[PDB]
Amino acid sequence: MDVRIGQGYDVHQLVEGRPLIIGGVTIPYERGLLGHSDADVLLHAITDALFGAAALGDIGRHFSDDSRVLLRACAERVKAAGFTIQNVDSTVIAQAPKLAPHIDGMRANIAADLGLPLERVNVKAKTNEKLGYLGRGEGIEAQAAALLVKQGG
Amino acid sequence: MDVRIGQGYDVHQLVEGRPLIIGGVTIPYERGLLGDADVLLHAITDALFGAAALGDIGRHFSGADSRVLLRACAERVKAAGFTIQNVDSTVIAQAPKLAPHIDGMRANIAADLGLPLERVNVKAKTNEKLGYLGRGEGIEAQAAALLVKQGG
Amino acid sequence: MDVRIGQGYDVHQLVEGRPLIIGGVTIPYERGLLGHSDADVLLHAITDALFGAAALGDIGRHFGADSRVLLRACAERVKAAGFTIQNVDSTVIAQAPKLAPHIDGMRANIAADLGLPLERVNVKAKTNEKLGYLGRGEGIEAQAAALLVKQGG
């Protein structure tokens, strides 16, 4: 099986009175994520990891001027280039709020959008131990990893 | 072959009054990690829970050390029906030099995972003096793991 | 099919006057990368990614040789340890300049250096949303992932 690795990264600034959306889950919080989209740091990092495993460039090469629509269009472009998806793993870095009670909603959103069962989608949460702009609550980071297979039939 | 990718991250603060323990090797040094706070073992553990779709550290573990945790992770990953292909990792530490301690780290990681040494890699990097990492205020580890869901 | 994952990281400070070289592509820009090589963050992170997957240590356990010479020697050692390369994916975090019209040149330098077709090499570019030393333009980062098969069969 012609297996391929992808990896992806995003970051957004956190600012007062904007909504916090992560992995398509809205998380009540007094700060929220600034970007030209709905600033979904997790879905973008996964969208990059899929384009990267497929050697299709990056989101910018695709989408310029919400984040689930983008994730689904990514999956459709990846499938048309002849790949099927093995699994996704990811980490979100946020000093707060606590993300654990939200993670299952994120997994559901990502699995629907990629046409995968739940068991092939993982999301992990981490603080940054109060270090740097992440640990000071000024930004949130996501990292993703994805495994594809180029068919192959 | 139902292959899966796992990736993991950790960071801890460096401070006076703590021993420095990375990959279960104690590295003599005037500073050490705050948290048993082994950044390398924790990152690898998250990467295996990740590849196995079993969530993360916090979802599993609320006196036990980072090696006990890594071995418990292994057992849960194997129970869920997975086999481990290999691990690779990077530790970002401005100082001290980790190179002569790296093979002791690999041995500790391979034993805890039931792997030969040839399926375990650890790498070390400075941060070129940039950021809290480059200023000696913290240490980072990054890991990647490849599993196979049996598939027997 | 004995598949192996590697991952790789590098960072370099940006300083006025010096040349900016990433992925072996020289990018005209008012700042440039310090290091004792030609400090090519992207080539190095890919280099570590390959030594990682092959469990052969890191660039320091191996190494007047530029970063392309190092990447090719990396590839020679990986092949001689009985490995074949499935693919490479990577990200470069640089707040500026735009890397997109340079990305095909990097992919070409890497594919030649790894002896891979273009369709197995991907390079992606991110800003850091003006956060941290990356966001202030005082450094650039590269992340990389690589997939190897130990032959095997």
Ligand SMILES: Nc1ccn([C@@H]2O[C@H](COP(=O)(O)O)[C@@H](O)[C@H]2O)c(=O)n1
């Ligand atoms: N230095 C950079 C940073 C970003 N980019 C491109 O801009 C697009 C959007 O970047 P941000 O999402 O970081 O704003 C990226 O996907 C990449 O296409 C670039 O071409 N050069």
Ligand SMILES: Nc1ccn([C@@H]2O[C@H](COP(=O)(O)O)[C@@H](O)[C@H]2O)c(=O)n1
């Ligand atoms: N923002 C965050 C950060 C961490 N967590 C949970 O807290 C646990 C411990 O996190 P730290 O080790 O980063 O302190 C994590 O494994 C995750 O389970 C969370 O639920 N929301």
Ligand SMILES: Nc1ccn([C@@H]2O[C@H](COP(=O)(O)O)[C@@H](O)[C@H]2O)c(=O)n1
């Ligand atoms: N704390 C550290 C950081 C780097 N190193 C070693 O030094 C080499 C050079 O690392 P840098 O490229 O980050 O300067 C690494 O490949 C690794 O061999 C180390 O042995 N301990």
Ligand SMILES: [Mg+2]
């Ligand atoms: Mg980082």
Ligand SMILES: [Zn+2]
């Ligand atoms: Zn984004």
Ligand SMILES: [Zn+2]
């Ligand atoms: Zn930890």
Ligand SMILES: [Zn+2]
């Ligand atoms: Zn470098």
